[PDB]
Design a protein around this nucleic acid. Structure first.
Lengths: 146, 58, 174, 37, 213
RNA sequence: ACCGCUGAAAGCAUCUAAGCGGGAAACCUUCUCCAAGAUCAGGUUUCUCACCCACUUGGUGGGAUAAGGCCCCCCGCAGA
RNA sequence: CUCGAUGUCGGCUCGUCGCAUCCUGGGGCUGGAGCAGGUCCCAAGGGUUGGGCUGUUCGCCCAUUAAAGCGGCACGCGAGCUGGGUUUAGAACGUCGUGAGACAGUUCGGUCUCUAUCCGCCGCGCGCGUCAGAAACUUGAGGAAACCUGUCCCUAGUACG
């Protein structure tokens, strides 16, 4: 049977991704699996496992103008109308961290652990990150084989 | 798959290689090995890599 | 066939490529230009500019011809000022040059003062004739676009700018 | 302009263009300036 | 830019102007009894100044407040409210100890006045929102003053959020814009404002310079 | 929507595929209001800032106290 | 699907939504001289009234208006209202039926039940957390309300004709 599940038997490391030229989707996927812990053999979907993920320089994520001017974002309030339609381009010019956050959350499962995982996410639009007291580990994207 | 990716190999080719080697080892105890002795997992990976032919053509 | 047209450089004071970017200096104000990355541009043995991309992508042909005419336009602009002339065919109009611009009012209140762009030359040839010149057909054309749609010239009698012709339409009697 | 789901030439002094995906006619004679939808 | 001062409403009266015209005047008392404590944007990006006004007893105000005010070096006051200034740097404008009076208004300048409105209490939609009341003769059993129907029946099987229903009103931060200051009584510190002001006699009034004009 | 600058594809032409600009009571800033239970639960300031037992020192309970607040009381043009 | 019950027209009251837009707004074209006006494109942010007669829908008409919009939401909404007509029992005229009686043909009268448990909504509190315990002032991510318009004068009796 399983050996990984156990209180305290988790290595909470920190990862840093320089999200400059990377595309939003591939970044979000790697962040999702890396965040949940599927890159580790001690996977245990029943618990909040995984490592901490830091997104650096989210402002520079390459997205075509064909989506900046067409991929609309919808936040309905609850009131009549109230469909807060706002372009992803404007969101990139205001709160790109919320755009990236949304993309990741859409790739994470929709359950209680998802929220416990969300609170393990730290996204900053700029490149200068004050969080240097911990042990950041620069992590880059790759294919494996095949 | 996680341990295999740590050894830079996919699950696909891992199982294919082990079958070519005749290593009729179930996934339960193989996954156990992944935790109890990661080095043994690495050894099995090297065996599979050597057993795999050359490419994706036939 | 546009790809076959070399680019003469009569001046060449600082006509040079600095990282997919053409710096141009000469008789008039200086110019610059970002080079379309897909297209390879290099200096000829005789000093002319060679714009080329060998591969087959058609958009490379569009960008090849395009960037060729952009560079030719840069050299033409820096060596020979661009000039567009404008003349009014109407009643009730006098051009004044108050401050640093042209004040127009074809028979209506609040005479319009065209906000000039940085780096542009204006001149008045008569109360109903004037001209604009510069080192950028886009900047000179910006004044042509700003003066447009300001009291739309009716095709009947006429009440606006013409560029010395253009076969402007005519009335149908009454 | 004459927006409609059909385009043809008013005379042989015009061109059919594809602007932003919309087909339209220019004929140096502002009579119709027809547009394909 | 948005200069201002705290005061209180002392009721309304009327006074005739130089053109033989009637000016309804609300009396807002805002004389030399307003002190400051700056809040620079360098620490939190707020960019504003705390205004204090009133009268208390030295044995009434609690220790955290006497600590703040005595740290500031300012005699304690009953009310405290912070006025947003401008989105610039300001800096060289207000300081700790600068006295602000009603003389800052130009005897005619338009101002925006805001404050807690008078309580009216829990009321039906006839007052809360102003519905057109239903008839009360031709068979109107027990519907006089009642809202009636809401939305649909089958498909929209819910009341839309934000409908106009019965509830409390009052005690709100009501702001009235572009009120004409009739006259700054600089000799007494009494600000005479054309028009009615939210709040009861004795209530707190916040006055600031208008921006539309 | 419309008009438009420069200019290719295609020696021309063209509001265009690179690129620039104008362009409406719609949209977003802007004006007013609620709002950190916004669980990412914020930020600034200030006060108090060792007190005694039980259990197993820790782990945990019990009692008391400072800031301060509440209860009760006198009132409100604030209020079921 | 619903007959061990979804209670039907019209009208009132209260909202929402589409745009195939009545007006306001932005433009093209014209057999658009100008005012006006035809047609077409964009646009839901507001407004879209008040009366006579019929039970009305639907229509007619007077007088105003920038305008007197088309539709969905159980032909919106009867555990919110009306009960005029429709569809109960009485009565009468006509037609048919020998007759009892019938008519989606007309004419008079003829009750409109429910103490709100849940969902949602509207308002205000108690508790706990917001990592020592508290008190003040506040950023406002994110949302709401509101978003209309005419007459006259000047330009100018000018341009145009």
């Amino acid at each position: 049977p399983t050996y990984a599940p156990k209180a305290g038997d988790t290595t909470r490391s920190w990862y840093v991704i320089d999200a400059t030229d990377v595309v939003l989707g591939r970044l979000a996927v790697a962040a999702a699996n890396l965040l949940r812990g599927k890159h580790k053999p001690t996977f245990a979907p029943n618990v909040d496992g995984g490592d901490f993920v830091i997104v650096i320089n989210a402002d520079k994520v390459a997205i075509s103008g064909d989506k900046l001017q067409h991929k609309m974002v919808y936040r309905h309030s609850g009131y009549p109308g109230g469909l807060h339609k706002r372009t992803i381009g404007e969101l990139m010019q205001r709160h790109p961290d919320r755009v990236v956050e949304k993309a990741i959350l859409g790739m994470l499962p929709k359950n209680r652990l998802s929220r416990q995982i969300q609170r393990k996410l730290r996204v900053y639009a700029g490149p200068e990150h004050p969080h240097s007291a911990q042990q950041p580990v620069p992590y880059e994207l790759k294919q494996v084989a095949q | 798959n996680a341990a295999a990716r740590l050894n830079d190999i996919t699950y696909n080719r891992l199982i294919q290689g082990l079958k070519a080697a005749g290593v009729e080892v179930d996934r339960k105890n193989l996954a156990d090995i992944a935790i109890s002795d990661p080095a043994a997992f690495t050894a099995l990976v090297d065996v599979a890599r050597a057993a795999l032919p050359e490419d994706v053509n036939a | 066939r546009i790809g076959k047209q070399p680019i003469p450089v009569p001046a060449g004071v600082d006509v040079t490529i600095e990282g997919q970017s053409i710096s141009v200096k000469g008789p008039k104000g200086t110019l610059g230009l970002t080079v379309a990355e897909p297209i390879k541009v290099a200096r000829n043995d005789d000093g002319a500019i060679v714009v080329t991309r060998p591969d087959d992508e058609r958009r490379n042909r569009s960008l090849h011809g395009l960037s060729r005419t952009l560079v030719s336009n840069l050299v033409t602009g820096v060596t020979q000022g661009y000039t567009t002339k404008m003349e009014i065919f109407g009643v009730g109009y006098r051009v004044q040059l108050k401050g640093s611009n042209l004040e127009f009012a074809l028979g209506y209140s609040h005479p319009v003062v065209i906000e000039a762009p940085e780096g542009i030359t204006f001149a008045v040839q008569a109360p109903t004739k004037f001209t604009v010149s510069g080192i950028d057909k886009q900047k000179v054309g910006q004044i042509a676009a700003n003066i447009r749609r300001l009291r739309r010239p009716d095709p009947y009698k006429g009440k606006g700018v013409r560029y010395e012709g253009e076969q402007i339409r005519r009335k149908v009697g009454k | 302009v004459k927006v409609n789901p059909s385009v043809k030439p008013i005379c042989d002094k015009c061109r059919l263009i594809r602007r932003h995906g919309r087909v339209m006619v220019i004929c140096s004679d502002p009579r119709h300036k027809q547009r394909q939808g | 830019a948005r200069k201002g001062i705290l005061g209180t409403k002392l009721g309304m009266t009327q006074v005739f102007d130089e053109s033989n015209r009637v000016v309804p005047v609300t009396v807002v008392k805002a004389g030399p009894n307003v002190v400051t404590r700056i809040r620079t944007p360098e620490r939190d990006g707020y960019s504003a100044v705390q205004l204090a006004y009133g009268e208390i007893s030295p044995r009434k105000v609690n220790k955290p407040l006497t600590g703040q005010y005595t740290a500031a070096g300012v005699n304690p006051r009953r009310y405290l409210a912070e006025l947003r200034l401008d989105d610039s740097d300001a800096a060289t404008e207000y300081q700790v100890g600068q006295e602000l009076t009603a003389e800052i208004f130009a005897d005619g300048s338009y101002v925006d006045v805001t404050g807690t409105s008078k309580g009216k209490g829990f009321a039906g939609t006839m007052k809360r929102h102003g519905f057109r009341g239903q008839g009360a003769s031709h068979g109107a059993q027990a519907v006089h003053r009642r809202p009636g129907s809401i939305g649909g029946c089958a498909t929209p099987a819910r009341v839309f959020k934000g409908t106009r229903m019965a509830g409390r009103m009052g005690n709100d931060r009501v702001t009235v814009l572009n009120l004409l200051v009739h006259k700054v009584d600089a000799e007494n510190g009494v600000l005479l404002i054309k028009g009615a002001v939210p709040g009861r006699t004795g209530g707190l009034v916040m006055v600031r310079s208008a921006i539309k004009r």
